[PDB]
Amino acid sequence: MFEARLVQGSILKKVLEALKDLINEACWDISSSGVNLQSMDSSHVSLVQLTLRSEGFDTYRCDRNLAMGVNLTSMSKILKCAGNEDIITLRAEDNADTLALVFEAPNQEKVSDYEMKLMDLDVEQLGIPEQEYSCVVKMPSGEFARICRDLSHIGDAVVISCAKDGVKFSASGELGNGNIKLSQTSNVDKEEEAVTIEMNEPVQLTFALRYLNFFTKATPLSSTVTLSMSADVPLVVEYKIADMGHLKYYLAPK
Amino acid sequence: MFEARLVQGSILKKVLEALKDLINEACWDISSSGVNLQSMDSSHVSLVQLTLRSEGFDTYRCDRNLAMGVNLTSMSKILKCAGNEDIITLRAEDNADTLALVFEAPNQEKVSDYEMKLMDLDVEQLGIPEQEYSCVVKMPSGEFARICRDLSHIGDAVVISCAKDGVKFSASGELGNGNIKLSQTSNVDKEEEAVTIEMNEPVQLTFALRYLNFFTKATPLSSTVTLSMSADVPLVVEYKIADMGHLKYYLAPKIE
Amino acid sequence: MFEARLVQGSILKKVLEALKDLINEACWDISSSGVNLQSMDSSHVSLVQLTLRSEGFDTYRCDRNLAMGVNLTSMSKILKCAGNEDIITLRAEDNADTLALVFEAPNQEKVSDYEMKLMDLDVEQLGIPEQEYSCVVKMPSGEFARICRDLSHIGDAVVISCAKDGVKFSASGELGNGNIKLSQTSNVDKEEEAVTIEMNEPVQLTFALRYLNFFTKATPLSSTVTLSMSADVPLVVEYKIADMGHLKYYLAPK
Amino acid sequence: GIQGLAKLIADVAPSAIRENDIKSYFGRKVAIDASMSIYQFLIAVRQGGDVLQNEEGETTSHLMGMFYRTIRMMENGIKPVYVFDGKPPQLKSGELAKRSERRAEAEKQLQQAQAAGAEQEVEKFTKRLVKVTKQHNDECKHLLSLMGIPYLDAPSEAEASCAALVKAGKVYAAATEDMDCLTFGSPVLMRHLTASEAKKLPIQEFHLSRILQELGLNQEQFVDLCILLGSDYCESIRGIGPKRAVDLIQKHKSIEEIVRRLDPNKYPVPENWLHKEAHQLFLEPEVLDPESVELKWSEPNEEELIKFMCGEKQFSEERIRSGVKRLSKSRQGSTQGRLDDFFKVTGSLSS
DNA sequence: TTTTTTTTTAATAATTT
DNA sequence: ATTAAAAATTATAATTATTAAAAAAAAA
DNA sequence: AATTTTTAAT
DNA sequence: TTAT
């Protein structure tokens, strides 16, 4: 009897608005420690690591380790029915494959019980032994969300270059040449919209920009995104969700 | 000959955005006591009963019982030209081949005359009796716009059930099952966010959500919608316009 | 060899959103005394004259009569890669056929160096003469944005009738007949709401609406638009572009 | 078919024509004459320049066209019954003699078309050579048995037996391209029942009881109007067309007083003037009993279409299997009732 | 009321084979 | 001349995949 | 099935 | 052996 009452219902809703266009179907590795999702996209390029710990949920309990298969497009349209101020309870059943979502606004009386039909794909999870990286670019997410939106009009590839002064999202293309030389600000005021770049070694990697448009759909979760990368390892697009775990995205470079 | 001056002209604007997606062509039964529209859908399911009374209009005068066959898609293109604050005057003289809409702007002085070419329609009117409905639910209007938009993502059929202390908007489909419960909140002092359920016998029906999504475009008119049900009697989605009248949406249920 | 630093970026941004639908390919006749453009649309009906003077730019350093060929769809994509308060610095080079655009944020440190691949085209000097105008109708620009959009639902033919008491926009079609009549409001204290008509010869002639709808995409550039025309003269839909020159739109009548 | 009955109805009685929608019926069963559907889906849907076929030789364009049309009809709640034409009567053989020479005129024209080889004229001329045999329907009635939709083999005529099905009340409408179903006496005739969602061809409904109210006739004299309008059984009078036969029937009522109240110099009576035989054929044809067969609606199967059409007709696997799933999601739901079952029409209002 | 963004539509050949 | 009718000439399309606009929903 | 010009009658 |  999995039951996760979440009082801030926009946290789960904005996750599913980000995975509805990139993950077709995945296994929610739901344990007693927290909600986990190690997935990979339908074009088999990118990797998604979503972690929701049990401290962010209000009442969390798991009788066993539940790994059910949920269609991410169908769960996102059902979470489109929830309000932005709703309270979301996930009353999954061990005996029958049905994930019951209960929405209830605290100011209102609207008890919105939503049950799902579940296709258990039983996909084996992909785990990555994460290590230290070269440049840990803690950068504002809603300002990063337009940066991949700007350079996608020019070309389908970007070159992200960590330097001494700051990062440089240089993107070429047949329409022209585009360089966004974002210097590091690191002001002590307004930490939710500041840039923090850690410096270890000079970095020059060429990426694919079609999936970075998909990666910026999780930007209403966190104000700050981490772009942590190294020399020949995929970058971690880490969205630190407030008082929970994290939603990390991966992209193997060109 | 017929002149219907409306100071709050956005009321007549918000009517025709709610009927342009349902009624292609309607007959406006212009009486001397008001403006009436009883035009059933071309899909033979849903009736629209519109009642703009004479006392709600500012300067209403009328002589004969007019009947203007109006392409309501062409009316909503013309009525989109006025803004939300313009004084809207309808005009139709003797041998009424055309309807003259005058969108008198009150402050910027944009006197917009709009002469509509009408159409020839022979639309049968349906005899609506006066009966007592079983479960009369007085919802917020914006809440009902949410609920029909929510359950249309699951399936094309809502299952409206009236419990003893609530109303249940159940639905099912390929995505799963969705139940929306609304307990009555008559203790709340404001009537804008209050659900009032008038109960004498419980009733459970099944209605199509494609027509109910067309019905929830009248939500900019009123802040409170009334749903009326009985056993094998159509759903009356009534939007009571303040000091003007009602926009009643009839809806034939699904019978097993 | 040419640097045109501009303080606010929405002046160049709202030009290109007005010009992306109407003009697909034109040449920017950039002079030492300002930025000029004497284009004509892809259907060869409406002639577009643009002037951005040198005194309205913050730093103007033009050295030669530069006439580069700019794809206006490719420029308006790069002008979509900027904020509404950005600092836009254009650059050009003598040997390279490249128009460079540097976007500077005013409160941030986002330097967005954009370069454009240019091409050679038919450099046409249209050369319209200045002449007198019988009916000069200055109106609010959002009012002219409404009336061209309001009458486009009926048909594609607008007659514009002049009087000292007001101006009449009338359109007709198979859907119905429209007649929008303004009034010469001389009692309005502000200038962004008053309609001012300087007429000596009354005039009434039919204009198309597919090109007048593209003329009303320049309505965020200024709050006032002036309509100058005569009996056989094309109508001047003239905008202001703050205090930097003017944007003349000519439309030949039907 | 009939030379301009639809133009006469639209130019005489426009209140008997209702341009409806594809979703406007929604539970009312119709009776498709399947022969015009089979000719429509062998003439319109081509591979380009010829018929569309697999490598086994036979054609299957009508199977996919009538497949997606049938699935789109039951998506909108319309429940089809497909009535196929049987052995035609001997009065129709004069039209089949005209159809034999008009097919053979295109056979000689195909020799002239294949010399030039221009695809604007090759594909235009080979559309006239479309012929439906027994194997064009024996491989086509087998598909509708997989749906559970009833297919009816008429003993004499599918246009006749569709009109007997509406007459008994077993079906609501006869959805038939020709105007003959008004002549055998269907009170509702439907036209242009097409799977497209656009209004390029609105669906036009012929109410025969509204025709006979507007014309002031009954069934036995609307047949007599069809004989002067050039039916397929017997030819019409050489000087009388659409506009000269409405006023003539309304002046002289029966067909036996058309001839005796006419000057034969201006209007020559033809030698093949079998009006009395066609009047017996139009009122009482030898059709099957509509009470003998019941319109059963069985559950469709998905695995049997794999061995019949995904393998033999080598179609797309992701479209037939999607087609049964979009059929069964529009079949198990409840039927939406019309509003006329609850409210009755009180006032007839006109502009 | 109006910016920008996503969702339907009317688009139009393009196979469907 | 208008009306009308028979010589002849052309027609039977529907799904997915894009696609380029075109208004709608969320938030300006 | 509809058009469509040409031939024919009121 | 069979559509308008």
Numbering used by the authors:
A (entry chain A), C (entry chain B): 1 to 254
B (entry chain C): 1 to 256
D (entry chain D): 2 to 352
Paper text:
Among them, PCNA (Proliferating Cell Nuclear Antigen) binds to the polymerases and acts as a sliding clamp to tether them on DNA, enhancing their processivity. Eukaryotic PCNA is a homotrimer, forming a ring encircling double-stranded DNA. One example of the PCNA-coordinated process is the lagging strand maturation, which involves at least four PCNA-interacting enzymes, Pol δ, RNaseH2 (Ribonuclease H2), FEN1 (Flap endonuclease 1), and LIG1 (DNA ligase 1). Two structurally resolved classes (PCNA-FEN1 and PCNA-FEN1-RNaseH2 complexes) have captured a series of 3D snapshots for the primer-removal steps of Okazaki fragment maturation.
The first class, which accounts for 47% particles, is a PCNA-FEN1 complex with a short DNA in the central channel of PCNA. In these structures, FEN1 binds to one monomer of the PCNA ring, and the other two PIP box accommodation sites are vacant. While the downstream FEN1-bound dsDNA is about 12 bp, the upstream dsDNA varies in length (14–19 bp in different structures) and passes through the PCNA ring. The high-resolution density maps show that the phosphodiester bond of the 3′-end of the 5′-flap DNA in the catalytic center of FEN1 is broken, indicating that the DNA substrate is in the post-catalytic state. Interestingly, the DNA substrate in our structures is different from all previous ones: The cleaved 5′-flap remains stably bound in the enzymatic center, with the +1 nucleotide of the 5′-flap still basepairing with the template strand. During the 3D classification, the PCNA-FEN1 particles were grouped in eight classes for structural refinement. Two major differences on the bound DNA in these states are their orientations relative to the PCNA ring and the bending angles between the upstream and downstream dsDNA segments. These states are named state A to state H based on the clockwise position of the downstream DNA in the side view. In conclusion, these analyses show that FEN1 is dynamic on the PCNA ring, which could undergo continuous conformational change to accommodate the DNA length variation between PCNA and the catalytic center of FEN1.
